[PDB]
Structure 1
């Protein structure tokens, strides 16, 4: 019947759907191919109510619901996407990494260099804001579980030889950072009131 879409476009679109993003520093072929065929990609995604947000400064592509704002409800619901709500600890970790990424972009500029941090610099703040689980080993296990969970969402890389991790630039496009700031303020108030 009709002709076929270019195999590269199909492959890149399926990748972007599987991982919800593409990175210039990781998969340059798909990234540049999608950017050079942007109209085609938005045409493919249009009928699913999907669209691509783009970032040349940070070299990040990502999907974004194309539903018109408040179309039928105050806050939308999309069949093919599930709006998960992170548990408390996960919210703290995203808040911490968001703030550190913002500081990194202050010191280095936006999208100029990847954000990095050491596990030993995160563990003290997790202890500060959540309490001691019983040992350094349990703290590290909890942090590893959380970091794996975020890696599932494409928010963090795996630990490397320096016990360091890289913060995925996708955080710059998070939904409600102000709610994260509010939660952080609530936490710094609770850490004081509780003791």
Structure 2
């Protein structure tokens, strides 16, 4: 009569949805489970228009909005995606983060999600763009506020005791060549009208 999906699959898929992504070094069991039935996963999510990418070389999985039967769309407009779209202020930090991530990867390898940075290093970087309001309290406040927003999108762990943070590797799949290209195009478009 009934054909209950593998309860293990049910656990793994429901967890993965609960967090939007899923990292091996943290929760390897459901991670492997989804690796075991990526097709079943997909068909489970397909009605929802949610689809799973994969990164074995770093130990990651995650959802990403499908683009079918209402072509393309601004993905974020989907009902189920649960947060407000990134905003180029965030993106300004995002680029810096990605730079550090790839730089550390290109010298420690791809064998860990432990790409780390100290908050104070960011300060000069933003200081150039967001300027220098000359009060560490204001700038560091805004810095942590940005970081908070990002952890809301899951990209970066919040500060630890040592004022150091771990970049979540999902960052990489956000700072895509293709997506970066669409972004640079739209940004040059903005430049052309700002002038």
Task: Mark yes or no: TM-score above 0.5.
Answer: yes
Show CA shifts across 1:34-70 (max 9, x none): 1122222112112222221111001000112233498
8 Å CA contact retained: 2:98, 2:175:
no
Deviation (angstroms), 1:156:
0.3
- Taking a change above 3 Å as real, the CA distance of residues 142 and 7 of structure 1, as seen in their structure-2 partners, is same
Distance in 1, Cα, partners of 2:188 & 2:160: 30
Distance in 2, Cα, partners of 1:190 & 1:67: 26
Deviation (angstroms), 1:164:
0.6
Deviation (angstroms), 1:31:
0.9
Show CA shifts across 1:119-176 (max 9, x none): 1111111112111234111111111111111111110002112211011110111165
- Taking a change above 3 Å as real, the CA distance of residues 88 and 51 of structure 1, as seen in their structure-2 partners, is closer
The 3-state SS of whatever aligns with 1:52 is strand
Deviation (angstroms), 1:16:
1.5
Structure 1 residue runs of 4 or more that deviate by more than 4 Å after TM superposition: 72-77, 175-195
8 Å CA contact retained: 1:92, 1:184:
no
Question: When the two structures are aligned, how many residues end up with a matched partner?
Answer: 195
Alignment of 1:74-85 (within 5 A): 78-81=78-81, 84-85=84-85
Indicate yes or no: 2:9 matched with 1:23: no
State the partner residue of 1:3. Answer: 3
8 Å CA contact retained: 1:95, 1:180:
no
Deviation (angstroms), 1:72:
7.0
- Taking a change above 3 Å as real, the CA distance of residues 185 and 43 of structure 1, as seen in their structure-2 partners, is closer
- Taking a change above 3 Å as real, the CA distance of residues 72 and 60 of structure 1, as seen in their structure-2 partners, is closer
The 3-state SS of whatever aligns with 2:58 is coil
Distance in 2, Cα, partners of 1:131 & 1:93: 14
Deviation (angstroms), 1:113:
5.1
Alignment of 1:1-195 (within 5 A): 2-68=2-68, 71=71, 78-81=78-81, 84-112=84-112, 114-174=114-174, 180=180
Deviation (angstroms), 1:114:
1.9
Unaligned runs of 5+ in 1: none
The 3-state SS of whatever aligns with 1:159 is coil
